[PDB]
């Protein structure tokens, strides 16, 4: 009258869940007055 | 008969690596081009 021992292992990686944000990095400002054509 | 040994999964919550590192985005040029001399 004995059942088994279903000690289900864990997940070696499991829900690591990397953010996967995706690179938005946007250095996008050289807008300092670039010598405007007003001379 | 006797108990068992571990092992199971199917899909233990797939997550996905991070997206990427900050790009250069849309680097600007300047406020206005043409000349820096006095108008």
């Amino acid at each position: 009258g004995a059942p088994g021992a279903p000690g289900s292992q864990g997940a070696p990686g499991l829900q690591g869940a990397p953010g996967a944000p995706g690179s938005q990095g946007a250095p996008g400002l050289q807008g300092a007055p670039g010598a405007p054509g007003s001379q | 008969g006797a108990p068992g040994a571990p092992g199971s999964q199917g899909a233990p919550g797939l997550q996905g690596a991070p997206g990427a590192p900050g790009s250069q985005g849309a680097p600007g040029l300047q406020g206005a081009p043409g000349a820096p001399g006095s108008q």
Binding site: A35, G37, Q39 | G34, A35, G37
Partner: peptide, 5 residues
């Protein structure tokens, strides 16, 4: 540019 300098 041919000028502005």
């Amino acid at each position: 540019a041919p000028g502005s300098q």
